[PDB]
Amino acid sequence: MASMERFLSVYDEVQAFLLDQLQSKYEIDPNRARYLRIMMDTTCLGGKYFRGMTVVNVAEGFLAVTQHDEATKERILHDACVGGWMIEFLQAHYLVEDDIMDGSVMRRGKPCWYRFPGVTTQCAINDGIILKSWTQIMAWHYFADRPFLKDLLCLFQKVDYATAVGQMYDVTSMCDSNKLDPEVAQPMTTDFAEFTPAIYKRIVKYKTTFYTYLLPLVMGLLVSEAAASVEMNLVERVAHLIGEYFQVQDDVMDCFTPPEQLGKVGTDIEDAKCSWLAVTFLGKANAAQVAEFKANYGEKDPAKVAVVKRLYSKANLQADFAAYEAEVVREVESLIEQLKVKSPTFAESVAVVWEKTHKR
Amino acid sequence: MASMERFLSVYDEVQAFLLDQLQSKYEIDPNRARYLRIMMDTTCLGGKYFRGMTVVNVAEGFLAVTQHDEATKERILHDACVGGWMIEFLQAHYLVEDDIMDGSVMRRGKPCWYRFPGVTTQCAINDGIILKSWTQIMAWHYFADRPFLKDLLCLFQKVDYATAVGQMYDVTSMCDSNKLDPEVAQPMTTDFAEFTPAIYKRIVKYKTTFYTYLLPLVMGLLVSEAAASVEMNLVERVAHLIGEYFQVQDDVMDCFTPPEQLGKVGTDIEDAKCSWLAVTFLGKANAAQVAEFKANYGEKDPAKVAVVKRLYSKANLQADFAAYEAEVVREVESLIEQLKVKSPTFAESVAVVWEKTHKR
Ligand SMILES: CC[C@H]1CC[C@H](N2CCOCC2)CC1
Ligand SMILES: CC[C@H]1CC[C@H](N2CCOCC2)CC1
Ligand SMILES: [Zn+2]
Ligand SMILES: [Zn+2]
Ligand SMILES: [Zn+2]
Ligand SMILES: [Zn+2]
């Protein structure tokens, strides 16, 4: 059975489980069940399933090099699908709540869940809570007797928390740290002193890399009972690196990829986000250019946003991107090596992850 | 050591742990640590700590009848405090997100967290996520080697999910079930056919009783290693009953307790909530009164809200409350009995829970 077909089948099975348990154990009625099935489909399906599929792909790699009964291979693949769906639903939880937080209009060329006429923010916040609770219901049901249950739950729990901290770093990235104060409305930075490479790195590492790269790779190891084929410090370092790279790309596309191809109107400029472009720009600009950046950044006025766009386009940022890109290709290859020692299999999965990221 | 002093001390210890781990392991900076410490204090302190204190009180009851070393008594009390704080922080998570969902202004005579000038909804949604993640960080840290770890986590997980489902039942309680549809904006019910005792009961059971009553009692048993001193079906039935009773009181006070004494302007009438008053009113009203209720309910106009208030006050609802109150006193006493068999200790704790609820 092809891996995608398997992964999508398991969604139908998990959905049916969740909804069936709502009726048999939570006293739900058919119309509320239907609303939650619609919610589930709309918030969880539609992407490429990169994150869930990585869990499957890692597990399929160990299956080729490890002796097992047929029934065990099937169980391991089924566990990888369920775990992959836990990461997809975790993502979904975050997408729903982030879109509410940020006033987003569209994602994947379709309205944000909260903007659906019969949803509203009042329901969408809680819909998002339910999405994350589902991930735990899946874990406890499907993995109740698995030796990896504790490690999976503890790992999931740490990644979730990192992601939340990451969101906090992100939403506060345009404030002066020393000005943060629940009692006082937060002004945007005037100096941009906190738009550094290290600070950017901290945002991206927590907000994205933990859930997008670390968790799918390690989940694959956990369901394969194969955490000993790796040096965990290496899996960390490689995932952080691939993760950062991926966010840099999204940061560049927010600005420069047409809204139709992007699936949303990018607003990082008007939101004053600490993006790769703003940081990298500020790292090379002269005093006149820094002045002009400061006069136009984080402002809804399209002229001022077009001013920021002009500075970036004129600053030869492609040269900086290319150089960052060469250094990451370099470091990632070195990490794949250092992993190839213990597991050609895992190094190969990490190689494929890297390729899908690099080639998008 | 008095139990409250102990419980509050453990908060300072857990806070210090959480914040220290953010700095040593999540790369946090002092001003973001301060923002989260403020967040934590403002969202988690200020109530009576009924829910967390019940965990402690249950455990103190078993300590009086069970042989243990001093060091073990201290460990059990410390575990009960931590677990009690997990329920308090779970509550906090829900209060923060609910207040955002509902457009609330005040709770406990102070502004809702999201309304604080340097918070905003963009941050408060995620602050709420962090609050719930904290409960898991506490559990994994403090209970890492405890035999009850799995049962605690699985229980916590089910209660959380029930609470979320409960919120869904609550926010949709004024819609016709057959009209729920993410694609279509939801009109308020015109027939009130779903304002029944059974339906009300389903809302309250999921939204409130699981986290307020079931979880503190069972957590106390779990940390005491004492789940065998009880028939779990009885602990369930008694908690549902005490839980319903408590919500009926809050439903009555939303309407009839002055805003200064209540700590918020009650809006159940204008929100068209399926409250004990609306259900009980509709269960005894004549055709003329039902007409008048339908013409005035779920409307911001203070005259129409004062019209609903007049109907209730004229409908002799105190007679219905008194009768409900006698039947619950009756059934709760019967349940305490049925529990007294296996554990005078646990029956006594449940007796105290009941008294604190009944006497408020
Ligand atoms: C294309 C890169 C995107 C992927 C989605 C990322 N965040 C969405 C909301 O919170 C979770 C993570 C932001 C970067
Ligand atoms: C005095 C009774 C109150 C206690 C708080 C209840 N809910 C608040 C928001 O979600 C969690 C539960 C509503 C009833
Ligand atoms: Zn965001
Ligand atoms: Zn982006
Ligand atoms: Zn509410
Ligand atoms: Zn209320």
The pair of structure tokens assigned to B67 is 């042989």
Structure method: X-ray
- What is the Cα Rg of chain B in Å? 22
Q: Shortest CA distance to A129 belongs to which of A170, A84, A83, A90?
A: A90
Residues contacting residue B8 through CB under 8 Å, at least 6 positions apart: none
Task: Quickly tell me which residue has 């690196």 as its tokens.
Answer: A241
Measured between CB atoms, which of A26, A164, A202 is closest to B133? A164
Measured between beta carbons, the chain A residues lying within 8 angstroms of B183 are: 116-118
Specify the residue with its C-alpha closest to ligand 2, atom 2: B250
Pocket test for ligand 2, best of B104, B203, B207 (most atoms within 8 A of CB): B207
B95 CB within 6 A, ligand 2: yes
Q: How far is residue A67's CA from residue A244's CA, in Å, rounded to a whole number?
A: 36
Q: How far is residue B123's CA from residue B32's CA, in Å, rounded to a whole number?
A: 12
Q: How far is residue A48's CA from residue A57's CA, in Å, rounded to a whole number?
A: 14
Distance from residue A191's CA to the centre of ligand 6 (Å): 46
Q: Does B188 touch chain A (CB under 8 A)?
A: no
Asked if A176 contacts A188 with a C-beta cutoff of 8 angstroms, the reply is no
CA neighbours closer than 13 Å in the CB half-sphere of residue A260:
0
> A106 by DSSP, 3-state: which?
strand
b/e sequence B251-268, b meaning 16+ C-beta within 10 Å: bbebbeeeeeebebebbb
Q: How far is residue A181's CA from residue A165's CA, in Å, rounded to a whole number?
A: 17
Q: How far is residue A144's CA from residue A157's CA, in Å, rounded to a whole number?
A: 17
Give backbone dihedrals phi and psi of B351, rounded to 5 degrees, phi first: -60, -40
The pair of structure tokens assigned to A104 is 């987003």
> B106 by DSSP, 3-state: which?
strand
b/e sequence A294-330, b meaning 16+ C-beta within 10 Å: eebbbbeeeebbebbbebbeebebeebbeebeeebee
Q: Per the CB < 8 Å rule, is B164 touching A129?
A: yes
Task: Quickly tell me which residue has 């735990």 as its tokens.
Answer: A136
Q: How far is B115 from chain A (nearest CA, A)?
A: 10
Q: Per the CB < 8 Å rule, is B185 touching A130?
A: no
Asked if A63 contacts A108 with a C-beta cutoff of 8 angstroms, the reply is no
Give backbone dihedrals phi and psi of A152, rounded to 5 degrees, phi first: -55, -55
Q: How far is CA B349 from CA B47, B103, B331, B335, in A?
A: 20, 37, 17, 13
Measured between CB atoms, which of B161, B168, B182 is closest to A38? B182
b/e sequence B114-131, b meaning 16+ C-beta within 10 Å: bbbebbbbbbbbbbbbbb
Residue type, B97: E
Q: Does A35 touch chain B (CB under 8 A)?
A: yes
H and E: helices and strands count for chain B: 15, 2
Burial class (CB in 10 A: 0-12, 13-18, 19+), B75: middle
| Helix (H) or strand (E) run with residue A111 in it | strand A110-111
Kindly report each contact of residues A352-360 with a partner whose C-beta sits within 8 Å and lies 24 or more positions away, as own/partner: A352/A57, A353/A54, A353/A213, A353/A216, A353/A217, A353/A242, A354/A242, A356/A50, A357/A242, A357/A245, A357/A246, A357/A249, A358/A245, A358/A329, A360/A249
- CATH class in words for A1-360: mainly alpha
User: For residue A336, how far is the Cα from the chain centroid?
Assistant: 22
Interface test with A, best of B158, B161, B184 (most A CBs within 10 A): B161
Residue type, B264: K
Domains in chain B: boundaries: 1-360
Q: Is B236 annotated as a binding residue?
A: yes
- Helix axis angle for A287-296 and A302-314, nearest 10°, is 150
Q: How far is residue B295's CA from residue B302's CA, in Å, rounded to a whole number?
A: 13
**Bridge partners (DSSP) listed for residue A111:** A106
Distance from residue A88's CA to the centre of ligand 2 (Å): 30
Q: How far is residue A192's CA from residue B44's CA, in Å, rounded to a whole number?
A: 34
Residue type, B125: I
Q: Shortest CA distance to B84 belongs to which of B47, B112, B38, B114?
A: B47
Assign residue B272 a region (left: φ > 0; alpha: ψ between -120 and 50; beta: otherwise).
left
Chain A / chain B CB contacts < 8 angstroms = 163
The DSSP symbol for A45 reads: S
Residues contacting residue B250 through CB under 8 Å, at least 6 positions apart: none
Q: How far is residue B136's CA from residue A126's CA, in Å, rounded to a whole number?
A: 19
The DSSP symbol for A187 reads: P
Q: Does A172 touch chain B (CB under 8 A)?
A: yes
Measured between beta carbons, the chain A residues lying within 8 angstroms of B129 are: 97, 164, 167
